[PDB]
Amino acid sequence: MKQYLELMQKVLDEGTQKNDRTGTGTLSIFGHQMRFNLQDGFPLVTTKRCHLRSIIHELLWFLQGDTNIAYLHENNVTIWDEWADENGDLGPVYGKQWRAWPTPDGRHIDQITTVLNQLKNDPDSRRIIVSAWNVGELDKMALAPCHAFFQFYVADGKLSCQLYQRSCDVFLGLPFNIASYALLVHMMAQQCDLEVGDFVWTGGDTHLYSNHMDQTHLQLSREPRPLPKLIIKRKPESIFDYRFEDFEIEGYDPHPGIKAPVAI
């Protein structure tokens, strides 16, 4: 996508060398923002084939408040293998915080349910937020939340969402992340009888891994193509009742997928 490719190029031109916790090394910039009007098309990168099967199952997995990769494996999703433990646990990551953020007093808060009720009863609210950045549980997570905090907004009957990604693997993670949240917006909008607005992506430490340079140059040599159209074939009774079969992408004809090693 135009904005994705411009970011990729910006990291190459302006990024500075960094030595991350892994020791792989990266080129990094700090602070960037992109906007995707969801009515212009589903923001699924076309300069490389991105498989939605993994994106969709991970999101449904998050919404169920599950943090054990069992469900993912049952659908052959391996994106979370490199961080799960012997029992397939990741600790109180995304799913847990989204559906059951533990309060100091031993109880839990369901942020997704809160958000749905806010969108339906108080759409003008400036507090429609979901945060996975539970400071008190970071030490228990297999890894700290990358897509850390997001906010919804309603105007002119349209639902928008802004994501703050504190750390972003531009080549491997970003395409996945953008599609995941764009999808969530479509789902929320459907449950709230709203049209889709913009997905605003904001990044903190936005980087390209040193061992992703060849792939980056390859992708930058490719021209983006018209974005596909997301079709939801069934309207479930709640945001928690979606299933893989409900989603279908139309008119998606991307350049060939590009293989690249992930940093552990």
Place this chain on the structure above:
Amino acid sequence: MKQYLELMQKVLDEGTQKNDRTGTGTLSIFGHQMRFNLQDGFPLVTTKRCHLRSIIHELLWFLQGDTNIAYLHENNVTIWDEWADENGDLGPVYGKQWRAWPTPDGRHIDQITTVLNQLKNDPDSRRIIVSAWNVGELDKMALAPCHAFFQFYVADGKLSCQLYQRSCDVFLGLPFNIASYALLVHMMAQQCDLEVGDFVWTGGDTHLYSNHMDQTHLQLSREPRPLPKLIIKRKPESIFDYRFEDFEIEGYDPHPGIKAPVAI
């Protein structure tokens, strides 16, 4: 400042009318980002005289982990009066979350000390973050955190910081918020023997209150003047030992102040 005036103009040009919690009504946009290179000068709005006295005291107050307005009153700062209870309490807002975020197992995390340790031992870390958005205590607070989440970054010996402000009163609050974090960056940089980088401001629901329009246009009719200069006269033993007198702003020649009503 150029960036600030351009944001005001952006809200005016692309904003949508919206009702709000205070029942005042606003003109708002969703998603914005701007940067202030702190080496260019201290980002204190010059198109209207801004009260640095209250800004400094509010920040020292946050850093002490205080959430009662008594300290502010002792120093003639009234910006938090409208929301404090009869005892002067605001609940576990900014200060409390910054210095003692309560975990579910009875511990408390001092995020400010944590960030300082990360800057010292692992400046390339991609998780040098402070969050005031404690989901479990939001409804104990007089108001939900506006400047809700911020991240630090270090490159070429310069300290940068990005703030995600989920709700922004552009006319009254923003000038304060920008100077506040710029001040914090200078303080942290001094404690860490780093030079200042950029302060990146990102907004969610960024609005102008309906009853701030004439004041906003009056301010927009003015040309920004040279940015003032911030001089820190001492290096305290810790980030928690600064005093009002340690700060001096030089060359601040603002246009006349413009009064406006705060939305409660």
